[PDB]
Amino acid sequence: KFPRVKNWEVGSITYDTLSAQAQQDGPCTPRRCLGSLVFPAPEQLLSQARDFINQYYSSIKRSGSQAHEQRLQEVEAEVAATGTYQLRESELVFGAKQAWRNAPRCVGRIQWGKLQVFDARDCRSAQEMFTYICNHIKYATNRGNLRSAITVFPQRCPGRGDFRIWNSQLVRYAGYRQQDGSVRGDPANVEITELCIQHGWTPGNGRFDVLPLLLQAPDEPPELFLLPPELVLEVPLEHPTLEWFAALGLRWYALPAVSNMLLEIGGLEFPAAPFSGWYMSTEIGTRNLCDPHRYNILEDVAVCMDLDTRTTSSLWKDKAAVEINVAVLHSYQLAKVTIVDHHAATASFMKHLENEQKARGGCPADWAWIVPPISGSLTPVFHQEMVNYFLSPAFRYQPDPW
Amino acid sequence: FPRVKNWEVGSITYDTLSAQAQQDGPCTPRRCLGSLVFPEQLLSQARDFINQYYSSIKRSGSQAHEQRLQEVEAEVAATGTYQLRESELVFGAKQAWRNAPRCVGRIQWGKLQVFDARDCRSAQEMFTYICNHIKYATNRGNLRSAITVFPQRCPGRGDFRIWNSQLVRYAGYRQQDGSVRGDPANVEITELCIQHGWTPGNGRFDVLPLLLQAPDEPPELFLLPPELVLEVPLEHPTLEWFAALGLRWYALPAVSNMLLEIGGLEFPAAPFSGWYMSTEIGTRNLCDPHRYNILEDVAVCMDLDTRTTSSLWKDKAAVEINVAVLHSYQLAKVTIVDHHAATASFMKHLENEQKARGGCPADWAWIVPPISGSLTPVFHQEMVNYFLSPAFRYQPDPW
Ligand code: HEM
Ligand code: HEM
Numbered sequence: 001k002f003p004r005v006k007n008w009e010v011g012s013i014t015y016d017t018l019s020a021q022a023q024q025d026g027p028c029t030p031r032r033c034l035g036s037l038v039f040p041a042p043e044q045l046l047s048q049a050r051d052f053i054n055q056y057y058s059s060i061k062r063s064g065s066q067a068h069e070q071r072l073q074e075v076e077a078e079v080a081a082t083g084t085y086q087l088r089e090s091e092l093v094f095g096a097k098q099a100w101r102n103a104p105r106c107v108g109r110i111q112w113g114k115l116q117v118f119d120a121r122d123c124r125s126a127q128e129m130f131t132y133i134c135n136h137i138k139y140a141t142n143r144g145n146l147r148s149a150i151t152v153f154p155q156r157c158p159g160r161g162d163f164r165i166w167n168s169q170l171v172r173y174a175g176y177r178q179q180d181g182s183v184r185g186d187p188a189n190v191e192i193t194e195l196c197i198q199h200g201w202t203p204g205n206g207r208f209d210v211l212p213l214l215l216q217a218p219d220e221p222p223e224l225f226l227l228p229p230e231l232v233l234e235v236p237l238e239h240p241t242l243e244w245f246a247a248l249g250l251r252w253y254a255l256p257a258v259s260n261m262l263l264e265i266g267g268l269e270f271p272a273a274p275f276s277g278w279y280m281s282t283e284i285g286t287r288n289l290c291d292p293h294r295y296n297i298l299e300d301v302a303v304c305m306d307l308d309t310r311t312t313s314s315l316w317k318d319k320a321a322v323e324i325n326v327a328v329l330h331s332y333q334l335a336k337v338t339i340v341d342h343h344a345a346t347a348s349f350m351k352h353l354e355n356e357q358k359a360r361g362g363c364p365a366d367w368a369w370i371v372p373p374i375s376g377s378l379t380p381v382f383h384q385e386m387v388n389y390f391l392s393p394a395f396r397y398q399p400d401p402w
Numbered sequence: 403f404p405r406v407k408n409w410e411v412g413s414i415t416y417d418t419l420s421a422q423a424q425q426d427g428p429c430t431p432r433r434c435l436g437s438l439v440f441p442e443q444l445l446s447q448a449r450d451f452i453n454q455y456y457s458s459i460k461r462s463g464s465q466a467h468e469q470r471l472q473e474v475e476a477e478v479a480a481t482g483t484y485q486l487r488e489s490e491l492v493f494g495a496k497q498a499w500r501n502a503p504r505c506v507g508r509i510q511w512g513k514l515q516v517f518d519a520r521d522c523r524s525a526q527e528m529f530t531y532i533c534n535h536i537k538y539a540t541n542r543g544n545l546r547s548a549i550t551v552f553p554q555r556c557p558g559r560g561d562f563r564i565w566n567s568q569l570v571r572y573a574g575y576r577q578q579d580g581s582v583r584g585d586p587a588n589v590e591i592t593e594l595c596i597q598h599g600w601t602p603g604n605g606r607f608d609v610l611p612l613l614l615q616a617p618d619e620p621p622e623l624f625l626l627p628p629e630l631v632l633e634v635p636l637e638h639p640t641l642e643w644f645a646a647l648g649l650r651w652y653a654l655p656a657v658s659n660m661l662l663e664i665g666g667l668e669f670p671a672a673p674f675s676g677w678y679m680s681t682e683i684g685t686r687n688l689c690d691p692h693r694y695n696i697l698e699d700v701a702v703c704m705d706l707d708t709r710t711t712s713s714l715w716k717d718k719a720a721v722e723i724n725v726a727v728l729h730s731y732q733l734a735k736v737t738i739v740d741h742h743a744a745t746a747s748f749m750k751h752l753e754n755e756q757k758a759r760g761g762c763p764a765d766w767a768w769i770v771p772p773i774s775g776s777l778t779p780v781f782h783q784e785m786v787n788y789f790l791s792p793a794f795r796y797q798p799d800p801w
């Protein structure tokens with residue numbers, strides 16, 4: 001049999017048949033589960049390529065056609081001659097969508113079919129790379145009506161270095177390692193900040209300074225490019241009823257654009273391929289502003305709210321964190337920037353799981369990452385058993401280039 | 403040896419104890435299933451537990467050690483099973499708690515009152531042992547941990563089984579509109595009680611009778627005297643209408659349907675109890691959609707905007723229900739603990755166990771509280787889950 005999966009809210013029971021097609025192995029064994037850990041050749045390339053091609057031809061309802069036979073024979077010939085092959089434009093668009101669709105830790109996959117794919121495979125310098133990224137930022141921001149996008153730079157090939165974007169996201173705020181061990185800014189960005197300074201950037205002293213980009217073109221040190229300020233839409237934060245909240249000086253940016261993951265399609269690897277969507281408010285409200293090792297504002301909000309912070313049993317932390325989340329959502333809706341709260345987000349993911357059960361017979365989901373960081377059991381994904389496994393195409397983590 | 407990181411702090415440790423995992427869990431390299439709720443060779447298991455026991459008391463390979471080994475050998479040669487000494491039984495009971503991966507309260511594991519009930523026959527004796535337990539553990543609101551071990555399983559004989567999933571359960575009555583009045587979780591046991599001859603109440607908080615089962619007999623209904631079942635009426639420190647909703651819960655969480663395993667012995671009835679973490683009552687029992695599901699009622703009462711999700715009315719209402727649970731238990735002087743204090747104590751347990759055994763089996767999904775996840779330190783702690791023995795285990799229903 002296949003793993004039987006159960007929804008404890010409704011009683012319903014599914015079987016995940018898709019999980020049998022899992023190739024690459026994860027970190028668990030029958031002796032011990034490591035699900036909570038954040039970070040866990042001509043003939044193998046051929047079998048990956050064959051699998052991907054079969055996938056494309058299934059998607060377009062054409063499996064076994066003449067064009068399917070021929071494209072498989074085409075790919076086989078190019079690998080035999082060059083050791084690699086090239087994706088057709090239509091295969092790249094399909095592959096980027098499949099990689100998103102396959103990402104077990106993404107709760108926003110109800111959208112996986114509405115992804116704009118920018119083909120940058122003919123890029124040949126850091127300067128051209130920057131222009132592709134600004135065009136992406138502009139397209140995806142769209143003055144606050146966010147559109148999902150991905151730009152795909154050239155694939156890894158033997159005898160030439162990779163394109164890399166050094167920044168983990170296109171928009172990040174500086175983190176200045178202060179002298180008393182502290183940090184002014186986003187602590188998560190202290191390393192990439194010190195790297196920007198070392199590469200010529202004149203730093204500021206704010207807590208919300210936008211970092212420039214370090215772009216690495218093949219076989220060359222990274223180059224610094226400053227984003228034009230009019231390109232980075234930002235939301236100042238205010239509370240619908242806590243007027244002093246505005247005085248806190250809080251901002252976040254509109255566009256979540258992950259730039260450091262590797263995209264893998266049919267055996268081919270794209271080291272630089274930034275992708276963006278829109279934010280779920282709990283990423284900003286709970287994790288980015290309340291994580292103790294981030295901006296860590298939970299106590300200061302609670303004190304201002306005049307909460308009794310001397311005993312945990314008053315639940316001051318939970319009260320302040322709710323209200324920080326209200327402010328984020330209210331602020332994005334005020335400035336007409338797309339945003340979704342963790343109730344709608346998780347309820348649309350329940351809709352995605354059910355589409356996927358029908359479409360494919362399963363859905364890779366990492367329960368610990370799909371359940372939001374506040375109000376977990378209040379969302380319906382909490383009560384949904386999930387099966388976690390690796391399908392390809394895929395987005396994968398990769399080493400820092402320095 | 404799995405590297406385990408804490409992300410708020412940056413500390414690394416190594417779990418060397420996972421190597422001692424005796425049994426197998428549900429996960430494989432192809433797929434992780436940790437989110438799933440329910441995933442004469444007796445000599446080998448008995449020998450291992452003994453080596454454990456004597457190592458724990460610093461008397462390994464000594465005289466008493468080898469004496470007990472040949473003792474159990476001959477006991478199973480003569481009988482087919484063997485008897486635990488009272489001290490080993492105490493030790494196994496504590497170890498099985500200490501090894502429970504889904505329990506956040508294990509900071510307490512050394513302090514547990516073990517009541518030996520292996521000399522029990524008939525359900526009326528069962529019932530007497532059980533009321534002594536409730537009396538000892540409740541202790542007028544100052545709660546104390548306790549377990550009562552009933553006769554082990556042996557060949558050719560029935561088992562002792564407590565049919566109720568807990569010693570204290572509220573009725574769930576199916577209604578002609580389909581819905582349930584009372585606790586929907588308990589609909590199945592509530593008809594079993596009515597079938598074996600219980601007079602149904604009709605409130606949302608009617609305490610069920612006990613369906614106790616002595617070997618090779620049908621179960622017998624027993625009613626708990628109301629003065630023994632201590633209950634907390636729920637009120638809110640500042641929202642004066644909350645009291646009128648009539649919500650209540652009980653004081654003693656007493657699980658009565660898990661099987662206890664020690665040195666290859668199996669105890670199908672060994673009820674244990676502790677005290678409650680507030681979120682168990684406030685969030686899961688009163689607010690799960692398939693339990694009392696009171697969240698919208700409370701939101702309406704708070705005049706929140708319940709027609710749009712982004713007002714976070716579900717979150718604001720949930721917090722205030724937890725606030726009322728905490729305030730009501732403390733006011734009535736019943737032991738309770740909030741999820742912040744509980745998760746910080748589990749962090750201390752992790753450090754202590756890192757030093758005592760080199761690791762600690764922990765099931766992240768059940769350690770992290772169901773509200774305010776990332777607001778507690780366990781959210782940022784990587785965790786390894788595996789099955790040591792002695793253990794507590796789920797087991798099929800008695801029917
Ligand atoms: C359009 C709305 C989207 C929403 C609301 C959304 C939401 C999220 C959230 C909340 C996470 C977990 C983030 C974390 O805590 O680390 C996540 C992870 C992820 N998302 Fe999505 N996302 C969206 C679009 C996209 C797109 C367009 C892609 C790729 C084409 C994508 C790919 C991924 C991947 C690969 C991860 C896993 C990385 C990790 O471990 O954090 N998402 N997403
Ligand atoms: C004394 C304070 C205690 C606290 C605060 C506490 C807390 C908890 C909580 C919150 C859970 C998760 C329950 C759930 O929602 O599924 C749990 C599970 C568990 N606890 Fe504890 N507990 C305590 C005492 C005990 C004792 C005395 C024992 C046995 C001697 C024990 C053994 C277990 C076991 C076996 C589980 C697993 C049950 C399951 O899978 O749900 N606990 N505990």
Ligand SMILES: Cc1cc(N)nc(COc2cc(CCN(C)C)cc(F)c2F)c1
Nearest residue numbers: 256257258275276277278279280283287
């Ligand atoms: C496209 C997109 C949309 C969206 N709404 N959210 C995301 C979040 O994606 C990531 C976020 C982090 C930050 C780590 N987190 C603990 C704060 C690390 C990653 F590797 C990610 F892929 C991506």
Ligand SMILES: Cc1cc(N)nc(COc2cc(CCN(C)C)cc(F)c2F)c1
Nearest residue numbers: 655656657674675676677678679682686
């Ligand atoms: C001794 C003790 C103390 C304590 N504070 N909490 C517990 C909770 O124990 C269990 C709870 C559930 C219900 C799981 N969820 C529906 C709430 C199922 C089980 F099998 C359990 F053992 C036990």
Ligand SMILES: C[C@H](O)[C@H](O)[C@H]1CNc2nc(N)[nH]c(=O)c2N1
Nearest residue numbers: 036037038368369781782783784
């Ligand atoms: C240790 C733990 O696995 C880790 O903190 C995970 C848990 N779940 C998460 N879930 C999301 N969405 N994002 C995260 O960063 C994490 N962190």
Ligand SMILES: C[C@H](O)[C@H](O)[C@H]1CNc2nc(N)[nH]c(=O)c2N1
Nearest residue numbers: 382383384385437438439767768
């Ligand atoms: C599907 C998921 O495994 C299931 O809902 C689990 C998750 N975490 C939990 N955590 C606790 N404390 N209690 C539970 O019942 C559960 N249920």
Ligand SMILES: [Ca+2]
Nearest residue numbers: 078085086087
């Ligand atoms: Ca070609």
Ligand SMILES: [Ca+2]
Nearest residue numbers: 577578579580
């Ligand atoms: Ca009818």
Ligand SMILES: [Cl-]
Nearest residue numbers: 256283284288
């Ligand atoms: Cl982010």
Ligand SMILES: [Cl-]
Nearest residue numbers: 655682683687
């Ligand atoms: Cl309970």
Ligand SMILES: [Gd]
Nearest residue numbers: 240241242243
């Ligand atoms: Gd105000």
Ligand SMILES: [Gd]
Nearest residue numbers: 702703704705
């Ligand atoms: Gd009113």
Ligand SMILES: [Zn+2]
Nearest residue numbers: 028033429434
């Ligand atoms: Zn696992």
